[PDB]
Amino acid sequence: MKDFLKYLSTAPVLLTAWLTFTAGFVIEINRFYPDALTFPF
Amino acid sequence: SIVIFHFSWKMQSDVWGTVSPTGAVSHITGGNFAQSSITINGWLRDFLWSQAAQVVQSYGSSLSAYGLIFLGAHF
Amino acid sequence: SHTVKIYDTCIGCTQCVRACPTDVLEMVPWDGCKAGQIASAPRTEDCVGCKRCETACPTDFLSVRVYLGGETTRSLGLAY
Amino acid sequence: ESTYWEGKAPPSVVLGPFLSKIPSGVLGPASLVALIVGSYCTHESNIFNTLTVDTIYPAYVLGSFLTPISWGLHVAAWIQKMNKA
Amino acid sequence: DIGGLNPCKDSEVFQKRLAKTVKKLENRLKKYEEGTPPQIAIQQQITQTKQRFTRYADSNLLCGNDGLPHLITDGRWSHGSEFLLPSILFLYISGWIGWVGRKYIRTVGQTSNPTEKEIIIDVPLAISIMTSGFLWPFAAWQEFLSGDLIASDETITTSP
Amino acid sequence: VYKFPKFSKALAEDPSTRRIWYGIATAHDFESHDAMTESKLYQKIFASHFGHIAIIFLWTAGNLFHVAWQGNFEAWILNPLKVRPIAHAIWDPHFGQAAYKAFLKTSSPANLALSGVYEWWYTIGMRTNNDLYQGSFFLILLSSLLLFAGWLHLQPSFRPSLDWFKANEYRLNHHLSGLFGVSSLAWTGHLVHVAIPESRGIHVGWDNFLTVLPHPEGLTPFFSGNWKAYAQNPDTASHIFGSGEGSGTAILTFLGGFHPQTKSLWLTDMAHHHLAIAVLFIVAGHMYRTNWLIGHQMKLILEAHRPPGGRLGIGHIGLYETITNSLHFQLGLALAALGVATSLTAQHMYALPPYAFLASNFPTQAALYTHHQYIAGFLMVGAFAHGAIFFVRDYDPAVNTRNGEKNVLARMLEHKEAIISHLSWVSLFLGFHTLGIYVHNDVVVAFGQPEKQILVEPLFAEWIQAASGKTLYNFDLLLASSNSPASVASSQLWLPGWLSAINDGKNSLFLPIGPGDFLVHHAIALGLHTTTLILVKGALDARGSKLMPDKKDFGYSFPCDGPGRGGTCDISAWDAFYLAMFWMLNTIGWVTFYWHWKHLTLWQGNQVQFNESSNYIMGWLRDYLWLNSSPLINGYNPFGMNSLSVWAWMFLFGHLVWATGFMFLISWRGYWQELIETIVWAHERTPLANLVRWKDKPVALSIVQARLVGLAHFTIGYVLTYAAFVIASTIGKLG
Amino acid sequence: AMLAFLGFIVQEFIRLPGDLYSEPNGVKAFFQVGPQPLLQIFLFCGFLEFNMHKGKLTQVDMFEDGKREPGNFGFDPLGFGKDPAKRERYALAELKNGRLAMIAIGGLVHHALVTGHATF
Amino acid sequence: VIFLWLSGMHFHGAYFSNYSAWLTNPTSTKPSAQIVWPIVGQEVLNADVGGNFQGIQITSGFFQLWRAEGITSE
């Protein structure tokens, strides 16, 4: 698991993981607080 | 693209449709392929413009994704 | 016919001469570099303008430069 | 000639051979007077009294033209002052 | 009010839009049966539509003649939650991203193989830099002061 | 295979068809011709200018003659709001009986006139088909004058020298004062003398003009200084144009706004405007020095303008010799000024219609705006292209540099990377966010929840509208307020006319704007910035870059530098123009789409359709293009045809030319040379055709020529299809 | 976590006078108190963070020069810790109490979320 | 990869489809085998395909193929 972790550190895998996480928290914010046109405050 | 356009228009105009109980055949477009598919203006108007009505009027309906993909594919 | 010029940045690596498809360039004696040779363009009437000569040039901004000019049946690559 | 300059102020030749010889002590007060007169003429033709077809007053108009001019006169006054004139 | 607009809480066309959307959703709801998942989904749609319209009404939102919320982005703090606060939020987040990217580029740019560490990210160092971007406004106005933010003349220029 | 490119021996020795193609495309590049001097260059340019002005005057004379002969100008005078102007008659042997019947107007098939010449000539005081004939006769005489002058100034004793051509001060004094001021003075004279009484029913022709006083007092107030007398008793609010009912006696007035009947600017307003412009330009034409010891030497003005602290380098010291010795710098400046000027014409002739009954001529309004905006884009791209050409072939760094320090122009090549990077940043910013908001609106509306749209009220632009007096946005700012000093100042001169016009829903003066206007203006800004980025990058990078640090040695237009160094496709400055032409066409298309849709909704009355559907892309596609294309495509159907049949044919023709451009742009050379070789073999190896052989060896079009041909097809198809669409849609929708 | 656990236990017991400070439940007190008192705590904690670490606040900036014992702010006004013999025991006790308080702070917060009344 | 794609198609037919309803009314129920989550208002894509079902109408003809295979249950 020394080269597998290095493989997971490559640009495509890291970008896919980061974009999946990013889309995930964006989608979940929009699920829990939907239809947010202005700042909540 | 020309092949699938020919298939779509010919089928809609001269095969597909409904049959009345007495045996009268009414097609989706109404047989306009025979007389209006012989000019480029006919293809532009009676096929592209005419059958693109459902795509452009799909907003707000369950087919709105098709309009969005229409616009995105144009883009 | 196109115009081919050689500049004293030539290192005499011969890669231009052995890349010319129409035998336009040749290596001639020189005393401005370690190899003691510099490219020459004595047969530019056969130059076709394909610029393979300067695709093989290792010097920074080239030592062989091809300036396209008047066209000829030889320079247009016309077999007819 | 040689209107090009790189020092603190341009040479007096850039003012033309009519302003090149005016002392700065003349141009300065003249520029201030022209600016005041032009501002008053503009404020009398308009602003204080609304303009009308029957009230144009070439004095106020010509006067008002002294405001744009004033700008040039005091620029020349500064140029003359910095050139020991 | 501003630009001839009126608050959406007093916009008749806004309420007409809400009523029409609710009526369409209820008409769709009529063609399903009992407490079946389709009816539950349509009821949730109706509830969310009502909640969204109510929130937009009570949001200091100005509606035009079409009954849609218009954004007042001239800079006034009265409508500051429409553009200004999201603007600050995005500026913070994007400055964070740019700062951590620049810091990673400059950090692995002083190693033996700078290009290798760009396709194969040093995840430990990347995590170290990324969580340090919360001070990007302060870090930027501490590196600009020291002259470490801008190059001067080692930058390359074309022939003319 | 010889003697055609007389100006180029290098081309005349080409054994291929490329010689003919390049002979056409290099005929006007006089600086590159064989045995070329500067004196011959300026003399040939001078003669070509004369021939060009003659061509323009002949074109105008032809328009006048064809309106006089085959038009319905006289009938249109008596009923300008119902009679449709006729451009010229049609005689085409290919017409069927149906086409003849559909195009039949009065006595012969004819084309409606969309140039607005009827309204323009009616406004300036033409009431007879014999007045137009006189104008055509006079213009042909003027064309003969200009042709004679062009021939004369190539004769040995009448060919001007370089000093005369480069005499900047004399030419500026004369151009400004004489051309602008005196032409405005003569136009004011005509306006008053002929146009003002003709709008009041009094005929002032070439017979009773020395005896018909333009004003009852007759030049007495002018010399006496009682200039107010020319403004007393203006045209009333019940004046019928071309008739004495409700008319006045004034000739120079401030009224502001529009005529209550023709919905156009007052003739007395325009006469006063041209008189003021004439006085101003005649005054300004005395600025520069000539043989009488007073005036300005612009070399001194340019050299003396260096900021003392020092931020523009050494200033403008080397600019005089740079501009004087370069014809591409001057051409670029002139083209940029002309582009801005014609953009101004387009933007003002719809908001402030100057011709009688032109506001109600919707097809001609759309045609005029589209024509002038396209010409504006062309002129701007030409200005930038000639700036790039100046950089390549006329710019001298030594002249623009004094002791290492660089002047104002040479410093533009030092921070060229900064300029290009910031243009790129602005373009990316605007594109990203305009497209993001548009696609957000698309998705949100498509999902059936239009309330979640992002709609930004254009408060900055509405602020400007309120400043000019529009009481629609409740700003109460400058002229929307009756107590502000801006309003009290002109409350007695031109506000009552101006306010009555700006605060009117039927005008195009300061059209009401909403979020759709905001988004489309940002799209326009993105288009302008991207076109500017391409053109500025090509101009600054014309002399060289990192990929080609000797690009100036290859000229303005060359195909490439080869596949080496990673590939150098489209690396020349000409290629930057070629790429920016697409962006200019796209930007002008956006501008004209916005204008035409806004005005179609305004004229039809459904301005709510634009205000709601213009915020998302599908709104545009469905409600402008798909909706208004219905009358055009039904110009001929399997059942019949209309007078719009020609517009549908032009629509399809434009699409075809566009796609042929796509041919010439996507498929490159090399693929067409081998095919041509196969065709050559086939011709050479076939009997009964071996008897016929070519003199020029058939070869594929060159890379640059192919780019030009594809661009020409793209542009011609673009222009033709949009002209057909706009005209046919306006005609078929608004009656 | 230790300070926050003590805050829970005191808040449900003692509380402050006033309508705002009248919620025995910490989770509901976070909402009733409003944003103004919480933002002041946020800004004060930020001021403390800045002044205690003396500018170097990030993972790459802190410990860049070394000479910084982890967790050593020098805060010792009452003088407990002068004797080095008990210093190690105090450090271990602080670490263990901190870990236990992290677990307990999570426990209390989630008890308030699933029940809603209080901790008691 | 192809086998995984086919397995996904069959799983969607089994779990997120109205195949059982379409079997009893092939001429009046539109085949649907993909339901859309209710996020950002995208639930409008769940069409009235019939058979007490909401989802995207399927044009790949899997329902007809499964019926021709004799598959009568999910």
Ligand code: CLA
């Ligand atoms: C993450 C580091 C980073 C930083 C600090 C910048 C900074 C800048 N870029 Mg830039 N850029 C980046 C990445 C970055 N860029 C990448 C990856 C690309 C390739 C798509 C570009 C392409 C690009 C262009 C084409 C242009 C700029 C421009 C600019 C300048 C103006 C800002 C702008 O327009 O943003 C532009 C930003 C984008 C187009 C999107 C960037 C894509 C993502 C968000 C960045 C990558 C994140 C990265 C993976 C994080 C990894 C770090 C982690 C491992 C620790 C500014 C100097 C403009 C300029 O010169 O103006 C002066 C300009 O014209 N950039």
Ligand code: CLA
């Ligand atoms: C009074 C004397 C006089 C007059 C009338 C002219 C007139 C002319 N000369 Mg000329 N010339 C003169 C003296 C004069 N010249 C002298 C003394 C010299 C020697 C120094 C020259 C040397 C010279 C050369 C070398 C050339 C000319 C050319 C021309 C013609 C220009 C083309 C044309 O038709 O423009 C017509 C233009 C108008 C009627 C007016 C244009 C209106 C503009 C576009 C509107 C601008 C309004 C406003 C500013 C817009 C901006 C909005 C604002 C808010 C900023 C024009 C006929 C050129 C030509 O074509 O030769 C045949 C040419 O090549 N001249």
Ligand code: CLA
């Ligand atoms: C008054 C304005 C003006 C003037 C004097 C010039 C003058 C010049 N330009 Mg220039 N240019 C202008 C405007 C102007 N241009 C504009 C507006 C643009 C932007 C489009 C350009 C873009 C441009 C480029 C890119 C280049 C020049 C070049 C040149 C030089 C040589 C011209 C040549 O060889 O012509 C050759 C003429 C042709 C090839 C004829 C082309 C005709 C086109 C394709 C239209 C014909 C089709 C027609 C519409 C048919 C209708 C179809 C039907 C079915 C409807 C010459 C100094 C060239 C040069 O080397 O400069 C040093 C050069 O490379 N110019």
Ligand SMILES: CC(/C=C/C=C(C)/C=C/[C@@]12O[C@]1(C)C[C@@H](O)CC2(C)C)=C\C=C\C=C(C)\C=C\C=C(C)\C=C\[C@@]12O[C@]1(C)C[C@@H](O)CC2(C)C
């Ligand atoms: C602190 C915590 C959560 C705290 C939440 C807070 C403050 C929330 C505040 C808010 O909600 C409110 C109040 C209102 C919201 O609107 C806003 C916010 C602000 C969001 C969770 C901890 C959660 C802590 C957890 C889950 C700990 C799990 C520990 C495990 C599993 C340990 C296992 C072991 O210990 C054993 C069993 C044996 C050992 O030998 C080995 C190991 C393996 C180490």
Ligand SMILES: CC1=C(/C=C/C(C)=C/C=C/C(C)=C/C=C/C=C(C)/C=C/C=C(C)/C=C/C2=C(C)CCCC2(C)C)C(C)(C)CCC1
């Ligand atoms: C490349 C080049 C070139 C070219 C360039 C160009 C082409 C440019 C363009 C330019 C342009 C195209 C510019 C524009 C400008 C504009 C402007 C500058 C404007 C201004 C305006 C104003 C200032 C206004 C103001 C106002 C207002 C706003 C309100 C009303 C009133 C008033 C008037 C006050 C040349 C050849 C030269 C040379 C070489 C280089």
Ligand SMILES: CC1=C(C/C=C(\C)CCC[C@H](C)CCC[C@H](C)CCCC(C)C)C(=O)c2ccccc2C1=O
């Ligand atoms: C189609 C095509 C061709 C082939 C087209 C050619 C060779 C033009 C064929 C001749 C045209 C149709 C004009 C024919 C005119 C008549 C022969 C009359 C003669 C007129 C001359 C005397 C001017 C290329 O050569 C080419 C080169 C580089 C990139 C793309 C392309 C490309 O797309």
